[PDB]
């Protein structure tokens, strides 16, 4: 099957001691068939071993993942994406907070969605940053940490039900978060939290 | 040394070529205590086989190799000779013993096959105790690849093959058939199976009882009685104890009769097998090869007599208890391995890359 | 030059004029040896020379006697032993992978004598081809079968006389009209111990019912595992598919041709009309067609197994042995 | 990105009316290639989803088997290609190299099918065939140039009526040609001494998917021990193991009361395959595919 080829494999490395810090996932050389489907998002391949790959192109990818399935490529770096395309707001100012670093209310309000505070999602959405295959290793980690899980895709589905819940917990639209860029979504929540406090 | 068991009873003509042996009558009767010739952990697994305490092939096949993972640990070389050549030499009468316990299955004759290339593969340069673990670890990453993985994989392609509302029959006990049905109601697939048995072993039973603990709706019936559950059933799934050159599935007696008779209610066939069980021989019919079990295990007690009690007694009479049974390539429509979902005729060219 | 020049033409007119090696096996050899004094005496620079000059030696003697396919597929087999050898001192099959993932002038002084040690290979492993055959005798026969052949095949001979030494078997031997060679076969077989029985092809349906597996020769073997056969053997074939009763062909690997049964007309071995009806009947033969074909064509569908020096396959591996022996491009020659 | 699915579907479209000969898949891979040619991408990873999402869209353009096949050979091509080189620069020029060598060998596939298998016609015989199909024109056109004589029937395919297309393309050609309704098979076939037809795809098992006709002269081939012969490309290999009719895709079956347009073949009901690489038995197909997939 053509669907299960791989060109890089995830290893995800865990520490017990703190799942929000020090939990990675780095690209090792595959260059094979895996012996499940295989995910792109962002240049970064998702085995899908607890979820089954889907087609179409429904609006949401909560739209996909509802009957238990992910899309075989979506967001902006595919063309034609299956989930529907999108933009979000405070972008600009996720760049302009980019040079911000870590260092009472503020601290608060961007400790989401880790718990702990942190600041690397600024840096995530920040204009100077390019995504390609070095940026894998770390937007994967970001994504595994986030979520409370072994499996990449279950790690995604729990990052966008949270992101859907603090949408309805601010009051947000659902239309307006499908899940087209996951990253641009937590940094417009994010930003909309410390305007907001 | 090992002395000949001796043949129980009258054969058939046609069977007069092949060797038949007594359950009771056991081996290990004419053989020191302890054991000197034999590795106590062959002659246990002798026991074993012999009085049939593990019957399928890919569990003769685990305990085989964890008994000569035990052996490879206890054994030591002598003194100005060679690991390769005398590992070799001492194990050909423990497989002697084995097969004179009972006749060897195809995939022990594999693993066998498999274990005496990797230790003529053993350089002479090589130190004895990084040899032996490292044939330890042979034995176990083979176990591990064509058992474990072979079987997910092999459930991962037939649950593709395997949709909502159908009827799957099964004929016997396999471990990859109840393994698939497993991992298919699990997956979300809702049918129902029928359970096809046939005497003296009923070894189908056993399936049953492992559908009843996953939740999945069963039935149960005989083999005489295939004829008249084929109309409703949807698909046949068949597992296989051994995959020859031309194609043919050699499996247990029943097996070829079961997809004769599905083939005359147009219901498709599938038979479902590891690639190690592939062999590289050739069989036409089931009389060439063959085993014969205990003819006495065909006494059953139908109310107060047993018709076939001291069935030696008539001269002319004879007993004829067949293990297993061949099917023709053309009754077969789909196999499905570790490597896809392949045809019979495409039997040989997995033997050309798997070798090579 | 002139000492092979005259074996050459003697090889010649001895196909074109019938005769000669009875044995395939020795006929083989005879082949092999012409091919290697062809390569030893002739003069030549590169590959393509040698490649051309056997070629035209081998359309000569596939054009002296079209029916001897033996003599064909010994020109090919060293063709593509030369091919081989070639790419293996020179650089480092058609297929979908080729497909997707994407010159014989050179010389090479060492060539020749990996040439001739390949041919020398091939002909030790052509000498151990019959008991290579019958070493398999006994996986295929067992106590009190019924065995059923055709005409007189010294392969099949080997084969039963190699069962016998241990089994206790029946042996049925129709007779090949109008050369009846089943006659030689049958005493032969009784002269081992052997119960036989002769009989004529018109009974070969009539007992099939009784007969519980057939072993039969060939004379070649097609590239989608049909068969060329002594005439009657398309009957047989079909009794035995009538009755699910197994066939199997026990022919040695240099009877396997890569020719297709496209070819008509000249598949069939016609001789004079003197065998089947003699030329004492009188004035009615002025006025009466008679033919007598001596080779008959059986299909793929209806061979069970093949039993080679390399073992036992089903027809429809045949292509995959054919892919392993001859290059695509001698087919045509 | 480069070239949205309007200008795909825009390219595959004036591909197949540029020039009628060439075939679906053949301009499926034209498309694709000619995709790859500006994608303006830098990974492996993005470039095969892109691929992908393009074969999605060009086989929701035609619901063909070919084009499928021609999806899946392609993608092939590229992890193959994928596999030699790791820099994606180097990669990219290695495909684009192959892609066009690829292009070239297979626009002439017609050409050695019509080759190696107009030996299989004899003088005076009758042909059977089930619908239009190039392939065989190609075939029957080498087999005229042969000097050879011969009479062909052909069924109209009644849901488009490609028949009467074929006969007048054999017509033009001065071919004695007859027009049989498609419940005639049956009986014409004792008429005929070989049948011979085309493929839109070949299946795992040897099998062949083709015009909804196809099975029942099949079947009454075999029923009166007639040669069926199938002339089909090597794209078309498809990695598909149906049981039966009903397990064909949906997507094949309809868009291209109960009216579908293809049916699967068996292995068993074929004689030999004629493809570029060669006269093959059903057996070979499945050989082929395993020798692809590693």
């Given at each position: 099957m053509n669907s299960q080829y791989m060109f890089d494999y995830p290893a995800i490395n865990i520490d017990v001691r703190c799942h929000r810090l020090l939990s990675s996932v780095s690209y090792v050389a595959y260059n094979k068939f895996h012996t499940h489907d295989v995910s792109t998002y962002e240049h970064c391949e998702i085995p899908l071993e607890k979820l089954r790959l889907g087609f179409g192109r429904r609006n949401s990818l909560a739209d996909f993942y509802s009957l238990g399935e992910l899309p075989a490529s979506w967001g902006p770096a595919c063309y034609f994406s299956s989930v529907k395309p999108m933009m979000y707001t405070f972008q600009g100012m996720a760049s302009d907070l980019s040079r911000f670093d870590l260092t009472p209310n503020v601290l608060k309000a961007l400790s989401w969605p880790l718990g702990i505070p942190d600041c690397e999602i600024f840096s995530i959405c920040s204009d100077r940053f390019v995504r390609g295959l070095q940026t894998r290793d770390q937007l994967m980690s970001y994504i595994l940490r986030m979520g409370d899980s072994h499996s990449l895709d279950e790690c995604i589905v729990q990052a966008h039900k949270k992101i859907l819940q603090e949408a309805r917990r601010l009051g947000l639209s659902d239309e307006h978060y499908n899940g087209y860029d996951l990253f641009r979504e937590i940094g417009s929540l994010v930003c909309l939290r410390l305007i907001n406090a | 040394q090992v002395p000949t068991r001796k043949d129980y009873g009258s054969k058939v003509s046609l069977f007069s070529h092949l060797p038949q042996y007594s359950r009771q009558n056991s081996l290990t009767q004419f053989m020191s205590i302890p054991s000197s010739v034999i590795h106590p952990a062959m002659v246990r697994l002798g026991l074993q086989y012999s009085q049939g305490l593990v019957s399928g092939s890919n569990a003769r096949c685990i305990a085989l190799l964890r008994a000569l993972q035990q052996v490879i640990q206890d054994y030591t070389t002598p003194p100005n000779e060679e690991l390769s050549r005398d590992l070799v030499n001492k194990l050909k009468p423990y497989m002697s013993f084995l097969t004179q316990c009972r006749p060897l299955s195809a995939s022990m004759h594999n693993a066998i096959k498999f274990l005496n290339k990797e230790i003529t593969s053993v350089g002479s340069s090589k130190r004895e105790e990084e040899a032996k673990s490292e044939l330890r670890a042979a034995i176990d990453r083979y176990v591990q690849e064509k058992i474990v993985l072979a079987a997910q994989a092999i459930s991962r392609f037939a649950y593709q093959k395997i949709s909502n509302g159908d009827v799957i029959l099964v004929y016997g006990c396999s471990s990859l058939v109840s393994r698939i049905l497993q991992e298919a109601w699990t997956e979300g697939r809702r049918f129902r199976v029928v359970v096809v048995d046939s005497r003296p072993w009923l070894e189908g039973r056993h399936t049953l009882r492992s559908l009843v603990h996953a939740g999945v709706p069963a039935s149960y019936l005989l083999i005489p009685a295939a004829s008249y559950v084929l109309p409703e059933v949807s698909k046949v799934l068949l597992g296989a104890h051994a995959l020859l050159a031309n194609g043919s599935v050699m499996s247990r007696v029943g097996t070829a009769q079961l997809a004769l008779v599905a083939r005359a209610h147009n219901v498709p066939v599938l038979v479902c097998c590891e690639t190690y069980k592939f062999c590289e021989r050739v069989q036409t019919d089931a009389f060439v090869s063959n085993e014969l079990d205990d003819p006495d295990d065909l006494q059953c007690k139908r109310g107060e007599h047993v018709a076939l009690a001291n069935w030696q007694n008539h001269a002319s009479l004879r007993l004829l208890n067949l293990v297993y049974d061949v099917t023709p390539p053309e009754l077969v429509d789909l196999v499905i391995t570790e490597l896809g979902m392949i045809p019979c005729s495409s039997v040989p060219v997995v033997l050309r890359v798997k070798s090579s | 030059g002139s000492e092979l020049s005259e074996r050459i033409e003697s090889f010649?007119?001895?196909?074109?004029?019938?005769?000669?090696?009875?044995?395939?096996?020795?006929?083989?050899?005879?082949?092999?040896?012409?091919?290697?004094?062809?390569?030893?005496?002739?003069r030549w620079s590169n590959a393509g020379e040698l490649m051309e000059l056997i070629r035209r030696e081998g359309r000569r003697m596939t054009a002296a006697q079209p029916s001897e396919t033996t003599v064909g597929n010994m020109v090919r087999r060293v063709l593509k032993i030369i091919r081989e050898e070639y790419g293996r001192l020179h650089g480092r099959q058609e297929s979908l992978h080729k497909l997707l993932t994407s010159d014989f002038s050179f010389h090479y002084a060492q060539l020749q004598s990996n040439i001739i040690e390949a041919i020398?290979?091939?002909?030790?492993?052509?000498?151990?081809?019959?008991?290579?055959?019958?070493?398999?005798?006994?996986?295929?026969?067992?106590?009190?079968?019924?065995?059923?052949?055709?005409?007189?095949?010294?392969?099949?001979?080997?084969?039963?006389?190699?069962?016998?030494?241990?089994?206790?078997?029946h042996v049925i031997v129709a007779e090949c009209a109008p050369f009846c060679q089943g006659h030689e076969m049958a005493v032969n077989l009784s002269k081992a111990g052997i119960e036989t029985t002769v009989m004529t092809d018109a009974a070969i349906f009539a007992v099939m019912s009784r007969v519980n597996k057939v072993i039969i020769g060939t004379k070649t073997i097609l590239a989608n595992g049909a068969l060329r056969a002594v005439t009657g053997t398309h009957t047989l074939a079909l009794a035995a598919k009538h009755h699910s009763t197994p066939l199997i062909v026990c022919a040695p690997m240099f009877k396997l041709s890569p020719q297709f049964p496209n070819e008509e007309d000249s598949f069939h071995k016609f001789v004079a009309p003197e065998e089947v009806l003699p030329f004492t009947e009188g004035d009615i033969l002025e006025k009466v067609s008679v033919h007598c074909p001596v080779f008959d064509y059986v299909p793929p569908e209806l061979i069970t197994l093949f039993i080679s020096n390399i073992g036992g396959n089903a027809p429809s591996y045949i292509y995959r042995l054919m892919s392993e022996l001859y290059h695509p491009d001698d087919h045509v020659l | 990105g480069p070239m949205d699915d309007k200008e795909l579907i825009e390219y595959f479209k004036s591909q197949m009316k540029e020039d009628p000969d060439m075939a679906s898949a053949v301009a499926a891979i034209r498309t694709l290639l000619e995709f790859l040619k500006r994608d303006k991408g830098e990974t492996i990873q993005g470039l095969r989803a892109n691929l992908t999402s393009a074969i999605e869209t060009l086989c929701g353009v035609d619901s063909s088997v070919a084009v499928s096949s021609g999806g899946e050979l392609f993608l092939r091509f590229i992890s193959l290609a994928s596999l030699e080189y790791s820099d994606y620069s180097k990669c990219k020029?290695?495909?684009?190299?192959?892609?066009?060598?690829?292009?070239?060998?297979?626009?002439?596939?017609?050409?050695?099918?019509?080759?190696?298998?107009?030996?299989?016609?004899?003088?005076?015989?009758?042909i059977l065939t089930h619908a239009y199909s190039r392939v065989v024109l190609r075939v029957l056109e080498a087999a005229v140039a042969a000097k050879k004589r011969f009479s062909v029937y052909v069924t109209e395919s009644q849901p488009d009526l490609s028949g009467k297309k074929m006969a007048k393309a054999l017509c033009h050609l001065n071919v004695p040609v007859t027009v049989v309704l498609d419940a005639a098979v049956g009986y014409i076939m004792e008429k005929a001494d070989l049948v011979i037809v085309g493929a839109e795809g070949v299946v795992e098992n040897g099998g062949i998917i083709n015009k909804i006709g196809t099975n029942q002269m099949a079947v009454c081939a075999k029923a009166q021990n007639k040669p069926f012969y199938v002339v089909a490309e090597s794209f078309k290999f498809v990695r598909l193991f149906p049981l039966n009719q009903q397990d064909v895709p949906d997507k094949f079956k309809y868009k291209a009361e109960e009216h579908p347009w293809v049916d699967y073949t068996a292995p068993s009901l074929i004689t030999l395959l004629f493809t570029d690489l060669g006269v093959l038995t059903p057996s070979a197909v499945s050989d082929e595919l395993i020798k692809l997939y590693l």
């Open positions: - | - | 010649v007119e001895t196909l074109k004029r019938g005769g000669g090696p009875r044995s395939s096996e020795e006929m083989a050899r005879e082949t092999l040896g012409l091919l290697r004094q062809i390569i030893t005496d002739h020398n290979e091939l002909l030790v492993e052509l000498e151990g081809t019959m008991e290579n055959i019958a070493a398999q005798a006994l996986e295929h026969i067992h106590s009190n079968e019924v065995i059923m052949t055709i005409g007189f095949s010294r392969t099949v001979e080997a084969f039963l006389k190699e069962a016998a030494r241990k089994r206790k078997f | 020029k290695i495909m684009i190299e192959r892609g066009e060598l690829f292009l070239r060998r297979i626009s002439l596939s017609r050409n050695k099918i019509a080759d190696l298998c107009h030996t299989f016609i004899k003088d005076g015989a009758t």
